[PDB]
Design a protein around this ligand. Sequence first.
Ligand SMILES: C[C@H](N)C(=O)NS(=O)(=O)OC[C@H]1O[C@@H](n2cnc3c(N)ncnc32)[C@H](O)[C@@H]1O
Length: 488
Amino acid sequence: LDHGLHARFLRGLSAAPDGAAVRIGTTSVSYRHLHRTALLWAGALTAAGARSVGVLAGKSATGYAGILAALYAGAAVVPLRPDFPAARTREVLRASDADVLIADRAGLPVLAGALAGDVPVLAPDALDGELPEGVARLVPRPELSLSEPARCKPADPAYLLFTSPKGVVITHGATGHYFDVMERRYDFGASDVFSQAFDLNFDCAVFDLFCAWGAGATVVPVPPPAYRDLPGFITAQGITVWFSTPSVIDLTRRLGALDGPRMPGLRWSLFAGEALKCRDAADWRAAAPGATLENLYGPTELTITVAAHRWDDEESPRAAVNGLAPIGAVNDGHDHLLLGGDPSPDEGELWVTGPQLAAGYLDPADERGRFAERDGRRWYRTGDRVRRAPGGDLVYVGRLDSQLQVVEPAEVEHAVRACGADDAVVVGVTELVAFYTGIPVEPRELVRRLREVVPLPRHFRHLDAFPLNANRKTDRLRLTTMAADGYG
Ligand SMILES: C[C@H](N)C(=O)NS(=O)(=O)OC[C@H]1O[C@@H](n2cnc3c(N)ncnc32)[C@H](O)[C@@H]1O
């Protein structure tokens, strides 16, 4: 089992071959059935010489098997979003130099557009007349099926993932170090049931898949209606491990769904992608009291997550800064610094180096200003302002470049929440606009409260919800435009 990332799936296969690898609605696909499908598809990918495989698919059997088939063929997985604009998907195919495309039924309608810039398509569910004319089809033959998955070197690409817009090359070796280190934090086993909440083109979906599969556990895609009541969905499905952006907490709370211990069977409550508020952690924890909660942090260029904090109902609120839970300690095997060009013991840009470094970007020229040399080593400059609490825990404060002159928006946001908002986004237009959710407050009352907690924005906007970007993060760029249009 030295194959690479996909060796995690082989370990599940060995532990629960006939157990459910993926549960899609009212049906399951077994490890064994995914394995054989991937061997079959990989034989076709191998015969066509595939080094990079576009996976143009949703949360379908085809899409999960397509990921595995790509890895089984020794190729990088290049996830493509069927619901993304076709022209964007064209750019990604060009940039990644994808050799083959695997498409499910959600991918078919976008495929004519996707291929309108030599790239055969493996689309099991399609009829011939459903592929655009010109496009050659990969029809996997059982006689060319591999007898076993390709074995890859730690340097080989496993995944090509795009940030929000550069292509990041994630290696087998880096995911190998990642899962080795994350597995040791947890107690996953074959009876666990993992959410699959992240989109397939977002790096955290790799944790969903390979932590579950590494344990012989079951992956359960979270369909969009489920967000009307996440705790109901978790309990109905017997989900033991939950992982998402922490926006789902305020969402669930707002809908009245976060009242009482509605998730008794949950064991792990994991959040990544944006700042986690203390208050949000404690609220989720009351709703899922038998689940350990963790705040997981990191950028795509450091393989999935690169720091972790295990929430403690008593200690974490003490270490909190600006109402935000700590991001904790960097993953084992990594060093970090907080730079001001001089290191600080207290606060600065977080720089990290270690085995989880991406191999780099699809265009090396993009590395400059992002990857950096220091003390003979290669680091990733996160562009995040991070503080060290007493205790040693790191705490994320904000984007390094968010500072203004009129000011640290994150301190204003914290003051708005201490005055009663569920959440706040403070942006510049130079003056301040403070968007907030929660109970509406007349702005002169909000100012009175803010002068009481911090002895100020000139404009306050109440929203039912912040807008979210493609990754289900607060869309701060959208809000900055809303501010400029309204008050420029
Ligand atoms: C978790 C996933 N690797 C991710 O979100 N990658 S990303 O490249 O899309 O975005 C990374 C940025 O999200 C923010 N972020 C990610 N996880 C976070 C956490 N737990 N707390 C605060 N900020 C976080 C930071 O600004 C970070 O640099």
